[PDB]
């Protein structure tokens, strides 16, 4: 063309703010983690507590 | 016939206004064409502002 003809290198650009995070499948093991007697995986906060190894 | 005979060439005719079009089949990836984050074929507007390559 030959009207207001700009440069190559002086066409602006512009960055985003948002970022894409990637995917993690959070757990399958997660209904089944109780503190209970009847759950499959237990927990115990018995060292949560005083002191311990 | 021997009544009143009209030509072969001097018969009239009658061409229609209304025209028709060939089918097109819109688009199958339609419902698919988003711009938000949870879509399959993401759309960006960020080079329809200012300017850039």
Redesign the interface.
């Known amino acids: 063309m030959a009207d207001f003809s700009l440069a190559t290198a002086s ?4 960055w ?1 703010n948002k970022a ?1 995070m990637e995917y993690v499948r959070r757990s399958r093991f997660a209904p089944y983690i109780r503190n209970t007697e009847n759950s499959i995986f237990q927990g115990y906060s018995d060292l949560e507590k005083r002191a311990g190894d």
Chains 1, 2 share one sequence.
């Open positions: 066409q602006r650009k512009e985003s894409h």
